[PDB]
Amino acid sequence: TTTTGESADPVTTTVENYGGETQVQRRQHTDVTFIMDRFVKIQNLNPTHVIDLMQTHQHGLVGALLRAATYYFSDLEIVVRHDGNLTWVPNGAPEAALSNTGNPTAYLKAPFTRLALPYTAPHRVLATVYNGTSKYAQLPASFNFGAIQATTIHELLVRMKRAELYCPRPLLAVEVSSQDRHKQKIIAPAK
Amino acid sequence: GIVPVACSDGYGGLVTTDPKTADPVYGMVYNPPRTNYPGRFTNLLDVAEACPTFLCFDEGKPYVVTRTDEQRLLAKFDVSLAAKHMSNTYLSGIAQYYAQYSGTINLHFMFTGSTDSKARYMVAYVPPGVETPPDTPEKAAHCIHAEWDTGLNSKFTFSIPYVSAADYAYTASDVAETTNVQGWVCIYQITHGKAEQDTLVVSVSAGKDFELRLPIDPRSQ
Amino acid sequence: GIVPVACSDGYGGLVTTDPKTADPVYGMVYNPPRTNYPGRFTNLLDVAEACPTFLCFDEGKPYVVTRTDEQRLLAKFDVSLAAKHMSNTYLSGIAQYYAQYSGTINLHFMFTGSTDSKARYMVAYVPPGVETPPDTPEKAAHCIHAEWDTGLNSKFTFSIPYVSAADYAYTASDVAETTNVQGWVCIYQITHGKAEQDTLVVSVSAGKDFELRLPIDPRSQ
Amino acid sequence: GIVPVACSDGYGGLVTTDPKTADPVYGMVYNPPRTNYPGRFTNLLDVAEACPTFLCFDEGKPYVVTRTDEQRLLAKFDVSLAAKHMSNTYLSGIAQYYAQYSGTINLHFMFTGSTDSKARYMVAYVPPGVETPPDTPEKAAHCIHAEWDTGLNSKFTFSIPYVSAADYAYTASDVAETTNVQGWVCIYQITHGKAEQDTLVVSVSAGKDFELRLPIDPRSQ
């Protein structure tokens, strides 16, 4: 196909043009809700921890995909390996509240605790980038899913439920020195 | 009496990708409305189809250019999402998270020269089976190819066909093997007139039937 | 054979707020009747709407008063359920147990002066964006405001509007931030006649669309 | 309250052959099509019925031959899937994985001699009950037998009947017992004309009602 490139209108040419035939495509895997729907690790933990999806690794499957969007929305599931009981408080709660049983508190039960939490921010959607301040770089303090507290938090896993992404942003593969390909060991039978 | 159950060994463990849901603990939460929020995308490939991103050539230029009016191989690259030239594209950004693919990959060529500069280019798909790529338009003509003039319309799009023995190909590469290298794409300049400093910007996007298959988390963390 | 079940890891623990019920152990208990017992309330906000409680000013007085007949800023307070002036109100009593709110907060002004004392007041809602509150009725006039005379009717009610960037605001405060301070309310006296020792009693209640959102237990125990 | 269950002792363990399925962890996988792929077989016995394989005689020859024109017992073997002569057949390959069988086993005899060589053979089924097999056609004639000429048609098929006290027989053998040795098959040459160096190739396949019963894993691993 020949088109006026400057306009930037999308152009999707096909194999048919030179006698080929287009082949049926199944894209369930690339579906946003599906691909974001899985448990991923959070690395920097402390006995008192505020749930911030931006804590996900920047090159992780979810971490990178989340970053490749400007705005997002979702509910959540968390898995916590903790010593003592775990207390969670919603977005906007005083840190002091994590000390009280009246808030959702889960009594220890091996090997860990898995919970379903609702989106609790005061905004219609959240962002992975915010050009400006929230005070009278970092993101505004209100961009969180609440906080959790236990005597010791050994592991945290987060899972995005009902994810919605908006306004996509750059997503990068590892850079290549070789100038031909990026080569690495693909799994193959032993012997 | 009560119901007898067999708590089964081998079942019950947490699997990071399981198809179940956790038990809820904080009910009755109503969210602020977000009806009709703009720019939503529901499938990564809708985006990869509509937004081509740039290829990377010598010295990281999203274009090729030649000072001689003779036939020249302006650029050649491997048909791999792992290719050096694709390393900064959104398509490759997305593909690194899937083990396999199949389908059409579309190349876009945009001429940026002045009104007084003309050129004629050729693009060829060289399947695997030859030791090295054709260095001349004559030898490459015997492949699936397209030729085009620079004129009123600055952009030309070409589909790199999926032609392989297996129904899917790996997105990653390892060493020259049948499942991870599907040939080369060669871009030639047949000739030009007064286009010594003028360039051909190249970008890539996903085709109508492009497909990515199996979710993976291979980045070093 | 019997039913196979997978006792799942991560489930089963007690959560103080879970949506299930315990197993019963003492059945057949019939209670004394309490049909039509008086004064029942089923939602805290029904009470907060119908029963205004007093604000707290200098030296803990539920009122303001000025000895001069000139224009004066009688009082100013932060539009925060955490405000010093609101600290003894039922609305703030209720709000400390919820993380967020939105909606109208209603102020009530009652004049207690003698028949021979008259005054004219003004109340203004100053949104965030200005460094400090207006010290004069002239400067505050450019805001959303109401003015009123003292006459036969002793009470005047005014709605402090919910105007913010986000759909909800925090009930608690931390430091000057966009989510926890929503401006000020300024009460001025335009002038008065023989009202040197006469007062204006102020109270607050919840508006038609006032709403509290997320249950919390933040008090030191 | 919740459902009361009795986690039962003696249940729950993994059994390598249980009739249940595991819990899934990687959904939405669509396979490359393999519609109408050739040479599919769904039951081992469909193959064992249609593809006879060779018996093994002296010095591992899939045939018998005699240099004398007189009556001779060309070969005798035990009616056992464990027999030495059956040891290289597909039928025995399959049977070693089942504890019992019943049904018809078919023998195939193919003459490979020249046009100028003729012969007349006999095959007999000797049931258990006699100490040793008949060494002559005369003595064996009193058994279930078949005789045939060599002519235009080179192949002759004969069914070894299932005749036993029990309804099933063991596929394996241990020592002379009623459940593991079901007699002998004796192949004789009644006479021949100029067939000194000519052979009779023998193969075996499963009959219409041949059946294998109970899956086992008895090979040394």
TrEMBL record, chain A:
Subcellular location: Host cell; Virion
GO molecular-function terms, A-Z: structural molecule activity
Keywords: Capsid protein, Host-virus interaction, Viral attachment to host cell, Virion, Virus entry into host cell
One GO BP: virion attachment to host cell
GO CC, alphabetical: host cell; viral capsid
Major site of localization recorded for this protein: host cell
Domain Picornavirus capsid: start-end pairs: 1-136
Protein name: Genome polyprotein
Superkingdom per UniProt: Viruses
